[PDB]
Amino acid sequence: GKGKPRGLNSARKLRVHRRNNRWAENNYKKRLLGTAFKSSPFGGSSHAKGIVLEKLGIESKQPNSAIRKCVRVQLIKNGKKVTAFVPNDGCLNFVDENDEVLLAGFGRKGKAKGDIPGVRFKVVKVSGVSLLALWKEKKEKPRS
Amino acid sequence: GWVPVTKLGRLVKAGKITTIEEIFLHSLPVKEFQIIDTLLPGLQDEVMNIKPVQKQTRAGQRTRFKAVVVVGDSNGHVGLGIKTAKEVAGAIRAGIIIAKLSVIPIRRGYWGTNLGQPHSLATKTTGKCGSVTVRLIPAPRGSGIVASPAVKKLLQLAGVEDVYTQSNGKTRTLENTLKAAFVAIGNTYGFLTPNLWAEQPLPVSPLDIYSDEASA
Amino acid sequence: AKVHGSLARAGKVKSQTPKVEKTEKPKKPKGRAYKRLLYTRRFVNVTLVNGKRRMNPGPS
Amino acid sequence: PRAPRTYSKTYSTPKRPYESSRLDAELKLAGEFGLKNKKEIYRISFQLSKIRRAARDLLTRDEKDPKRLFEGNALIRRLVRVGVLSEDKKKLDYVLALKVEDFLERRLQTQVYKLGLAKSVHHARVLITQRHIAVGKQIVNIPSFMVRLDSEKHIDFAPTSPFGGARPGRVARRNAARKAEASG
Amino acid sequence: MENDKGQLVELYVPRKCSATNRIIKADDHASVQINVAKVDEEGRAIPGEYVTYALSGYVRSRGESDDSLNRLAQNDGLLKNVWSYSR
RNA sequence: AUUCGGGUCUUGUAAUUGGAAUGAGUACAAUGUAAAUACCUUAACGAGGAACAAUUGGAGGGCAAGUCUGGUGCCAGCAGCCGCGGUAAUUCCAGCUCCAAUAGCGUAUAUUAAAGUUGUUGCAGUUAAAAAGCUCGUAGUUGAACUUUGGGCCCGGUUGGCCG
RNA sequence: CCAAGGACGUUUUCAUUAAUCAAGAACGA
RNA sequence: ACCCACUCGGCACCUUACGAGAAAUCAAAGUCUUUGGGUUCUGGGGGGAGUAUGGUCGCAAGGCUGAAACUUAAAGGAAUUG
RNA sequence: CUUUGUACACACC
């Protein structure tokens, strides 16, 4: 009779089986355990501000030979270390030292983006000015 | 010139059968394409995709192109052909030829109240090819053919204005979903409906009646 | 792993590119007039219809 | 803590962004009837989708249903009042057979074109928006007006405008001043 | 079938099998049309006068074409004691 | 129907030229308002381009639109995915051109559809993930057929139907 | 030697005593 | 005890495919988009990992239940040509 | 050259 019970008074069995098999998915368990609240670096938020600690020259994965020009920052609200990839060409000259940066995700819902290993975040704004306006010379970086 | 070799081809060359409906009425095997584009001059062709197929040998990889062609006129008659060939233009050429030999009719019906001309299918129907199942459901007027654009092209070449489609399986395989859709539109004339419950006097074959304009 | 690298090479091609100034063009009609321009130069000006209505060709 | 205003969205984007057939058809329609975006086509198709959903929900119930009779007679009365539906197509299923071109044919743009005052849809647009058009005795400057199958006998140029009297015009007065000082 | 007022529609009203009373599809290439000539009082058949029996591909493929042909031949009277209702 | 001559009527293109039409923006006044600010009216002023000048994202595929030009040469970088770049880059950096939405357009995060990848409708378990080693067995779920049927006699409603 | 079991045969008897089974229990190279 | 014919109940074997399947194949793995006879259990891409911890049984070895952080764009099944 | 096995496909280096 195709597995599951089909009786008119068997709704409880279907409900408890659906709960137990709902725990087998990935997004439902991630939501209900509060893993975004607990173990995420951002704490479940879309963006996060941070203080840049240093610069890294992260290699690109195989097959690709490049250096990805990332930075290591520390988040203000939690205080954990986070590697973020400075997006465009020549923008590493804008994010030098102890800057106040805004980080977002990559669009891979917390997974590594491309050939860059072990990063999850990109720098959006530095010192209150966006990197795209600085790259296109629309605005110009403030004092400190 | 044609010079057919079939009794059916000779009779349609003579002009004895003036419409294609006797062929499906008496289930005659359509055997040469010139019968089809003599009896149905209004059909157009479209080629959906050309995919390279590879046969690997000891010395390189032999390349051919598989071309699928859907032909048909926009009231009733649909054909589907699939042909692989070493040259691409021969692949569309043999594709339109094979699609001409596979012409089938469509049970077009009404979703409700039978007011005007038939716009949709008479019944729900399905087709399965490989892992792909395609289900067609009658739809109200002006709903359009809600379908992926390949099978949407197929049923707008068929003559349906509106239909609901459902799919299951690996529908990205284009040949399997086009063949499943062809089976689904072929099964419309397989279903027995209460308007067909009446008995018929079993008409005599044109292959027998006009047998002295035949091959012999 | 390869975490370090030559950070002095950043912005190489962006700096090495030659400055080319954007030429002065007459102003395109806008809004409804732009759609009028696209409609006229796609259908009644059907001039580039080479094999299958090719509208952005290369110089050949 | 006052009672909130109700508002709604009037358009709806299609599911597939980029396909050649739909883009071709809608830019053909926009060039034909003189629209400025695809948002007009989206709005009219949204209205037609609402109308078709209402007709489809009414047709599922049987005939002689009081709800079907009342709302169906109201809907065909409204659509034949506007002019999007002919007076002989009054069977609630030709409502399902409508197209967006019948809606697009009843705008004030194309009505000004069909009345012969403009000689183009774009001249109709710049005539309507520049307030030289009165549907009754009332000035309208909006092309998506949906005239009501009676008002087109009264569509004429504005009384308080050039091409309707009572003043020559702004730059006509400017040029009159120029030839007046040229006379002096 | 019909629409509202006349104008016969449904091109190609299909034939139906004389054994299982199912319709015969357009590409049912195993279906056959048995034509039996009838005799008028002289031992000789008349050209053009037939009785006609259509058999679908399914009943023919199962091997049950001959028993069904026995049944419809004995039902029309041209056969006498080959097929029995009681099996 | 007079050689390829004028072409009436056309549909677009111009380092071609004309008169018109109008609002954004000021503003006397009136209206508005508790008083104002705006709105709707309206004297007067207020388009010809270098003006009163529209962005955002992209052009290998998915997925609409470049084998065009110059630079870099597995570097810089691009890329949600596949992938591009190692001196002939349709993918990077720019110009030209084109494309899509448009006073809006992109990015991140969450969620919904797509998802018949939560499956009541509606999944799957031989070999792809998955039949508990087998049996007994409580709760739970499910459980053979059978008991008034048929026949008549009236009454009055709705859809019809010639009669209109 | 001891009890058990299937199938068959049956115009023998009971009368729905049943199917699958969380917990639990027996057996298990 | 054989033989013939039958029937019931078994372990099976051989041929086809109306049907199923992705195929190998299947009288069940059929009567499943024309989707519901009743019921028990299990699974939701691949590793980490049947690992850690917490319980529980065992003299012990171990047995049962059993994650997460993180990491990856494929692992995998059946067939065809070399 | 057939059959057989493969987790080989830049193919047993």
Write up what this structure looks like.
- The structure is cut from a larger assembly and holds chains A (144 residues), B (216 residues), C (60 residues), D (184 residues) and E (87 residues).
- Chain A contains 4 helices and 6 strands.
- Chain A has 144 residues and is of the alpha+beta class.
- In chain A, a hairpin with a 5-residue loop joins strand 2 (70-75) and strand 3 (81-85).
- Chain A is elongated and about 75 Å long.
- Chain A starts with 10 loop residues before the first helix and ends in a 9-residue tail after the last helix.
- Chain B is of the alpha+beta class and 216 residues long.
- Chain B has 2 domains: 1-105, no CATH class; 106-199, no CATH class.
- Helices cover 28% and strands 28% of the residues of chain B.
- Chain B is built from 7 helices and 10 strands.
- Chain B has helices at residues 7-14, 21-25, 33-39, 88-101, 149-158, 174-186, 206-209, and strands at 44-56, 61-72, 77-85, 104-105, 108-109, 120-121, 125-129, 132-138, 145-146, 163-168.
- Chain C has helices spanning 12-16, 32-44.
- Chain C is built from 2 helices and no strands.
- The radius of gyration of chain C is 22 Å and the shape is elongated.
- Chain D has one domain (17-184).
- Chain D is 47% helix and 0% strand.
- Chain D contains 7 helices and no strands.
- Chain D is an all-alpha fold and 184 residues long.
- In chain D, helix 2 (39-60) packs antiparallel against helix 3 and helix 5 crosses helix 6.
- Chains in contact: A-C, B-D, B-E, C-D.
- The interface between B and E is medium-sized, with 33 and 28 residues.
- The structure holds 4 RNA strands.
- It is classed as ribosome.
- The entry lists the keywords 40S, Ubiquitin, Deubiquitinating enzyme, Otu2, Rps7, ribosome.
- The entry is titled "Cryo-EM structure of in vitro reconstituted Otu2-bound Ub-40S complex".
Largest interface: B-E, 33 and 28 residues
Q: Helix segment count of chain A?
A: 4
Q: What percent of the residues of chain D sit in helical stretches (DSSP H or I)? A: 40-55%
Derived structural class of chain A: alpha+beta
Distance from N terminus to C terminus of chain A (CA atoms, Å) equals: 72 Å
Quickly give the structural class of chain D.
mainly alpha
| Topology, number of strands of chain A | 6
Subcellular location (chain A): Cytoplasm
Pfam families (chain A): Ribosom_S12_S23
InterPro entries (chain A): NA-bd_OB-fold (IPR012340), Ribosomal_uS12 (IPR006032), Ribosomal_uS12_euk/arc (IPR005680)
Keywords (chain A): Cytoplasm, Hydroxylation, Isopeptide bond, Ribonucleoprotein, Ribosomal protein, Ubl conjugation
